[PDB]
Design a protein around this ligand. Structure first.
Ligand code: HEM
Length: 184
């Protein structure tokens, strides 16, 4: 179940978030914790391409080896709040599972600055969703969450101590593949 109307950052700077670079997930929280694993790697690239907001996603489960990439076109609901489609692709942008109506995610940027961000997403696949997922992002894959993002977590009524870190997984990313997916 999706249960949160996540509030977008006051003064959100869309060009700085959507600048073509990679964001690494450093910490995450699902409000339905059993919906996602406790060991995981994820990253995204976000940018504008051909006049549209795009994200490219990467997921990796270091226990099961499940690996997948997605390309997403984002439509604007309001500043910092988007509805994204997705197509599953290989790392080269070739399609594995096509866009399908009813497969989509909402995406809200709750906080962002030059190095860090806090986002909410609720993923829908037909009549099923993956619950409310929060992620702390950083421009540096290893970086510890700083004071400002932690203030944003607390101002959303969340407890940062409940987030799961991705650090123990020693994740590695294919940054060229991920960024290049923005034009796919
Ligand atoms: C960082 C922003 C994230 C976005 C925008 C996001 C979005 C998505 C999307 C679009 C899918 C479906 C992909 C497809 O079928 O083609 C998906 C699947 C999944 N996501 Fe995320 N995700 C994000 C982060 C995470 C994080 C941090 C976790 C933590 C475990 C996670 C766990 C999963 C799992 C387990 C699946 C597989 C669901 C299934 O196979 O039914 N993702 N995610």
């Amino acid at each position: 179940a999706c249960t949160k109307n996540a509030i977008a950052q006051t003064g959100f700077n869309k060009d700085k978030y959507f600048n073509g670079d990679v964001w690494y997930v450093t910490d995450y929280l699902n409000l339905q914790p059993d919906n996602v694993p406790k060991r995981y790697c994820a990253a995204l690239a976000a940018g504008t391409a051909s006049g549209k907001l795009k994200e490219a996603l990467y997921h990796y489960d270091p226990k099961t080896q499940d690996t997948f990439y997605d390309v997403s076109e984002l439509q604007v609901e309001s500043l910092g709040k988007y509805t994204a489609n997705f197509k599953k692709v290989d790392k080269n942008g070739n399609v594995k599972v096509a866009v399908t109506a009813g497969n989509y995610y909402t995406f809200t940027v709750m906080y962002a600055d030059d190095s860090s961000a806090l986002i909410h997403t609720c993923l829908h696949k037909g009549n099923k969703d993956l619950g409310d997922l929060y992620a702390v992002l950083n421009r540096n894959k290893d970086a510890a969450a700083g004071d400002k993002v932690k203030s944003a977590v607390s101002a959303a009524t969340l407890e940062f101590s409940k987030f799961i870190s991705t650090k123990e997984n020693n994740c590695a990313y294919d940054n060229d593949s991920l960024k290049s997916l923005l034009t796919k």
